[PDB]
Amino acid sequence: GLVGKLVTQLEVNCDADIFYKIVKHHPNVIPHFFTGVQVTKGDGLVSGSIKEWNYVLEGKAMTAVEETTHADETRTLTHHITEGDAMKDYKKFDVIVETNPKPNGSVVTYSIVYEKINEDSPAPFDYLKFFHQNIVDMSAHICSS
Amino acid sequence: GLVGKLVTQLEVNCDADIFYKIVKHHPNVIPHFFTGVQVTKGDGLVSGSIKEWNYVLEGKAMTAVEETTHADETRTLTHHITEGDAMKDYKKFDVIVETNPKPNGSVVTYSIVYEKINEDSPAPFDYLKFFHQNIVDMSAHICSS
Numbered sequence: 120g121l122v123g124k125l126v127t128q129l130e131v132n133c134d135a136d137i138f139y140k141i142v143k144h145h146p147n148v149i150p151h152f153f154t155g156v157q158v159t160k161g162d163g164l165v166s167g168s169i170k171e172w173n174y175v176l177e178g179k180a181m182t183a184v185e186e187t188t189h190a191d192e193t194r195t196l197t198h199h200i201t202e203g204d205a206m207k208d209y210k211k212f213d214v215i216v217e218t219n220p221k222p223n224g225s226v227v228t229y230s231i232v233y234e235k236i237n238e239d240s241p242a243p244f245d246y247l248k249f250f251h252q253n254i255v256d257m258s259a260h261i262c263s264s
Numbered sequence: 265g266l267v268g269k270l271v272t273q274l275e276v277n278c279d280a281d282i283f284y285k286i287v288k289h290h291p292n293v294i295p296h297f298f299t300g301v302q303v304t305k306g307d308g309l310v311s312g313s314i315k316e317w318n319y320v321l322e323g324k325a326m327t328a329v330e331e332t333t334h335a336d337e338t339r340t341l342t343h344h345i346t347e348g349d350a351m352k353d354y355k356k357f358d359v360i361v362e363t364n365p366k367p368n369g370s371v372v373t374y375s376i377v378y379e380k381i382n383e384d385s386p387a388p389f390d391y392l393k394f395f396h397q398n399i400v401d402m403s404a405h406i407c408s409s
């Protein structure tokens with residue numbers, strides 16, 4: 120089992136497009152900072168970012184290089200990791216965030232698409248829980264009106 | 265975030281229908297046993313089961329009552345938990361296993377569909393990892409020919 124995908128999906132009581140705009144532009148207790156740049160398309164408007172993150176996951180300090188892009192039409196954010204501690208375990212590591220209206224608020228889906236270096240590599244449950252708790256935190260700071 | 269779904273999806277080098285038949289009818293190192301019954305449809309043939317499991321998850325002994333059904337046409341197995349330790353955290357807890365051919369072997373998807381009792385409940389990452397490791401183990405004991 121070298122290629123796979125982990126997903127956390129959560130219902131949120133918020134219009135999909137509004138929630139997407141919140142996620143696209145947004146905890147201090149988790150140690151983290153980044154340096155990097157913004158990327159533009161051609162009309163001079165920012166379309167994404169390339170960031171080098173320094174962070175602490177489950178007590179351990181790590182770095183990652185991440186390129187973020189977005190698709191407003193499908194309310195999708197994509198984080199493509201090119202370098203860093205996670206690349207000791209994964210040949211490929213991408214995080215896709217989608218927000219959609221409930222067929223019925225919204226459903227938010229975080230998917231971690233991965234390919235392991237070898238069979239001794241773990242699947243990224245640590246990252247799934249980290250992103251899940253981050254999105255639960257953010258969502259509990261949002262309310263109607 | 266009270267209603268959600270966790271997923272682990274893995275690629276396997278096996279025909280979908282064959283892999284489904286293997287999963288449908290299949291580690292001793294994990295402490296577990298069950299008692300219970302088989303369920304029939306009307307032609308007298310077994311269509312499912314109702315089992316009371318006794319097991320140890322992350323060192324802790326637990327019980328669960330599980331009703332399993334299957335859909336051969338869609339290669340889907342469904343495990344519906346009605347009682348047990350997990351129901352201290354979840355109002356609803358269902359595990360859905362799907363096997364499909366790669367649009368290209370197969371893709372196996374384990375989904376845990378849950379509703380928490382309250383916001384203090386955890387999301388079932390412990391169960392996701394347990395089912396993931398179980399399916400990785402099983403799949404590493406299967407080879408071509």
Ligand SMILES: COc1ccc(Cc2nccc3cc(OC)c(OC)cc23)cc1OC
Pocket residue numbers: 146149150151172174175183185198199200203205212213214246253
């Ligand atoms: C190795 O995997 C990653 C590691 C760090 C990041 C950085 C990152 N991207 C998006 C949202 C984030 C949100 C975070 O919490 C505020 C955070 O702290 C480490 C990092 C975040 C992304 C990663 O994949 C998207």
Ligand SMILES: COc1ccc(Cc2nccc3cc(OC)c(OC)cc23)cc1OC
Pocket residue numbers: 291294295296317319320328330343344345348350357358359391398
């Ligand atoms: C609380 O959640 C559950 C707890 C136990 C089970 C029992 C079960 N069902 C299917 C496959 C299993 C496979 C297991 O490993 C061999 C196992 O050991 C506890 C239990 C299994 C299912 C559960 O949900 C499907």
